[PDB]
């Protein structure tokens, strides 16, 4: 009753919204938030694909995706805490010393 195309398009909308939030924001925290949005959109697309075929494989890939999301959110927030400790600001443009 639900089209597969509509679920895929919803996942794509959330993915490009997360990418936009990743690019436009100077604060590192909103960059991590956009990364979480993109990975949740990818997991949602896998759930839609698995539910269309009547397979468990979509939910299994969802489990793997949220395991990755948990690990990446942990590591990124640790790095953000380190940045706020060392430099007392979360401006990502100031972390730009290496160039050339």
């Amino acid at each position: 009753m639900i089209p597969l195309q509509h679920g895929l398009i919803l996942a794509a909308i959330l993915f490009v919204l997360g990418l936009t939030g990743l690019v436009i924001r100077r604060n590192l925290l909103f960059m991590l938030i956009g990364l979480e949005i993109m990975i949740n959109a990818s997991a949602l697309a896998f759930v839609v694909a698995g539910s269309y075929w009547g397979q468990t494989d979509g939910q299994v890939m969802y489990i793997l995706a949220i395991s990755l999301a948990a690990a990446e959110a942990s590591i990124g927030l640790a790095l953000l805490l380190q940045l706020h400790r060392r430099r007392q600001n979360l401006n990502i443009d100031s972390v730009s010393e290496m160039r050339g």
Binding site: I63, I66, S67, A70, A71, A73, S74, L77, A78, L81
Partner: protein
């Protein structure tokens, strides 16, 4: 069916009555009456909770179908839980899971 849609209606009514009761309670509270740097240990504890929660989800999915997985599933869950306890022992022994030093 009939019983499943009756239960769907009952669950939806339960949801909306509970939410409306709380919101009405706060609305009536506002209406009536006359007027006149934290340490990183919090982050570490929340992070440990997240990691062990995902690993717990794997054990949740294991526990439902024990008699459909045989002894091989028990073996694989045994290596899973062994790595779980190895990580727990690693965290405890280094001071990660201690609020005070």
């Amino acid at each position: 069916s009939t019983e499943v849609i009756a239960h769907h209606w009952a669950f939806a009514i339960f949801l909306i009555v509970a939410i409306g009761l709380c919101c009405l309670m706060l609305v009536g509270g506002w209406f009536l009456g006359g007027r006149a740097r934290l340490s990183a240990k919090f982050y570490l504890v929340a992070m440990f909770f997240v990691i062990f929660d995902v690993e717990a989800l794997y054990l949740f999915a294991w526990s439902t179908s024990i008699r459909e997985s045989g002894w091989v599933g028990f073996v694989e869950a045994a290596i899973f839980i062994f790595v779980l306890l190895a990580g727990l022992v690693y965290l405890v022994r280094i001071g990660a899971l201690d609020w005070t030093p």
